[PDB]
Amino acid sequence: LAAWVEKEAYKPGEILAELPEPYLFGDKIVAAIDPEEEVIAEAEGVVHLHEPASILVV
Amino acid sequence: KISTSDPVRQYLHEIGQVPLLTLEEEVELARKVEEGMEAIKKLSEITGLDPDLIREVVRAKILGSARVRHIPGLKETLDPKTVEEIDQKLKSLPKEHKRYLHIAREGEAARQHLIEANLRLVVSIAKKYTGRGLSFLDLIQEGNQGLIRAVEKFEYKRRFKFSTYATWWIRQAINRAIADQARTIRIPVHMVETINKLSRTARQLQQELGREPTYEEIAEAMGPGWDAKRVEETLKIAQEPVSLETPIGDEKDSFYGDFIPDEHLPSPVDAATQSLLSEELEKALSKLSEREAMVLKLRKGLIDGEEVGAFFGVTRERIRQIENKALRKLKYHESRTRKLRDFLD
Numbered sequence A: 001l002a003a004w005v006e007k008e009a010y011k012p013g014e015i016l017a018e019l020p021e022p023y024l025f026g027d028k029i030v031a032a033i034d035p036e037e038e039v040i041a042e043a044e045g046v047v048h049l050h051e052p053a054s055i056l057v058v
Numbered sequence B: 001k002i003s004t005s006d007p008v009r010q011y012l013h014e015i016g017q018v019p020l021l022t023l024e025e026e027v028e029l030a031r032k033v034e035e036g037m038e039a040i041k042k043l044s045e046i047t048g049l050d051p052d053l054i055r056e057v058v059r060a061k062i063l064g065s066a067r068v069r070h071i072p073g074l075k076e077t078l079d080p081k082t083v084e085e086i087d088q089k090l091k092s093l094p095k096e097h098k099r100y101l102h103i104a105r106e107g108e109a110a111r112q113h114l115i116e117a118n119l120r121l122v123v124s125i126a127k128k129y130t131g132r133g134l135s136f137l138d139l140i141q142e143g144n145q146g147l148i149r150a151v152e153k154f155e156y157k158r159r160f161k162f163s164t165y166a167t168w169w170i171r172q173a174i175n176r177a178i179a180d181q182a183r184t185i186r187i188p189v190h191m192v193e194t195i196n197k198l199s200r201t202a203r204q205l206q207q208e209l210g211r212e213p214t215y216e217e218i219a220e221a222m223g224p225g226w227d228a229k230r231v232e233e234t235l236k237i238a239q240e241p242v243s244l245e246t247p248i249g250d251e252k253d254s255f256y257g258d259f260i261p262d263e264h265l266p267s268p269v270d271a272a273t274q275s276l277l278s279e280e281l282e283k284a285l286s287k288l289s290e291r292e293a294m295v296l297k298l299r300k301g302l303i304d305g306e307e308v309g310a311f312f313g314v315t316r317e318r319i320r321q322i323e324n325k326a327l328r329k330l331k332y333h334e335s336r337t338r339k340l341r342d343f344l345d
């Protein structure tokens, strides 16, 4: 979902450098930059709301 | 036990366990339904199979086994082998198209899910179109058919949510139903509204006269082309029928249908009529010329009611000639031996 939002990982291989400052000394994004269930051409196709943790017994 | 409560509880319980969140769940499902469409179509494109076929096979795999295909739609899709063949090509679709298959099913499911969740919406709606002449369950059911209709056309791209959308698509389904089934003798929607306007108008007219409007007022107040003959006619159609089986007179044990007489059936008098009439008409028909007598006997008594087109090859002059001369010798000798005079009719 968020992959395309921050173009860094879906556009080129930059999800590793997305980990900000300690990389100089599977998904791993920035410290905390996005807060919506959207599509980011321009923050247009969105849906900012709740987040379920539905346990499927399977 | 009693039927309204059980269904009410039936869907209310499922909504109670799964209402759809305002935005999220309706968005989610919506998105899946559409992708299903785009999927099925693209499936049609790569399989050459009609989107109708792709649609029913994903339905069977998600909604029901051979059981649901065999009883509902009689038998053209082989219960097992047929649909299966279709699922096999769907599997063969590599990584790229297989994706559409997997999506189509998931989309089909979501659909049903959205439909389930928005059933309270129907009943809440259908609740007010109650006293129109349809059973509450019948009303909810048509309205239900309406919500399914909405599901087919909602474009999630256009931000508005399914609530307001279903409202319209349901109200239309209901009103139609009300106009198509409510009466024994069907009445088009226009006549219906026509009747409502007539009623409403009679209402505002009752308002001050103290005189149930003569069909004069109703015409006036109604509008452009309303006249007495029109109103007397509409309200005549407005009266629903009466129960052929109704308690009559001292309701003790009276049933309305034993009293209506019968018309096609020849009461004895008529059977005797056709006996002598046919025997005597048959006697005259024999001792004669079969040239213009049978022509007018058959043209008049055998098929339909054409002097020229009445006689075979011989023109009009021999027709009128034998018609009028044989018809009069026949009448004047029948005047002698008076058998026909006493008008059998």
Ligand SMILES: [Mg+2]
Pocket (backbone or CB within 6 Å): A018, A019, A020, A029, A030, A031
């Ligand atoms: Mg980081």
Ligand SMILES: [Mg+2]
Pocket (backbone or CB within 6 Å): A016, A017, A019, A023
């Ligand atoms: Mg790193």
Ligand SMILES: [Mg+2]
Pocket (backbone or CB within 6 Å): A024
């Ligand atoms: Mg560096």
Ligand SMILES: [Mg+2]
Pocket (backbone or CB within 6 Å): A022, A023, A024, A025
């Ligand atoms: Mg470090």
Ligand SMILES: [Mg+2]
Pocket (backbone or CB within 6 Å): none
């Ligand atoms: Mg080192």
Ligand SMILES: [Mg+2]
Pocket (backbone or CB within 6 Å): A032, A033, A034, A035
């Ligand atoms: Mg953030």
Ligand SMILES: [Mg+2]
Pocket (backbone or CB within 6 Å): A001, A002, A036, A037, A038
């Ligand atoms: Mg998201």
Ligand SMILES: [Mg+2]
Pocket (backbone or CB within 6 Å): A043
């Ligand atoms: Mg925004």
Ligand SMILES: [Mg+2]
Pocket (backbone or CB within 6 Å): A037, A046, A047, B024, B027, B028
């Ligand atoms: Mg969303």
Ligand SMILES: [Mg+2]
Pocket (backbone or CB within 6 Å): A048, A049, A050
């Ligand atoms: Mg939130």
Ligand SMILES: [Mg+2]
Pocket (backbone or CB within 6 Å): B038, B039, B042
């Ligand atoms: Mg597509």
Ligand SMILES: [Mg+2]
Pocket (backbone or CB within 6 Å): B046
């Ligand atoms: Mg191709």
Ligand SMILES: [Mg+2]
Pocket (backbone or CB within 6 Å): B074, B075
């Ligand atoms: Mg058949």
Ligand SMILES: [Mg+2]
Pocket (backbone or CB within 6 Å): none
């Ligand atoms: Mg065939």
Ligand SMILES: [Mg+2]
Pocket (backbone or CB within 6 Å): B079, B080, B081, B084
């Ligand atoms: Mg089978």
Ligand SMILES: [Mg+2]
Pocket (backbone or CB within 6 Å): none
């Ligand atoms: Mg089986």
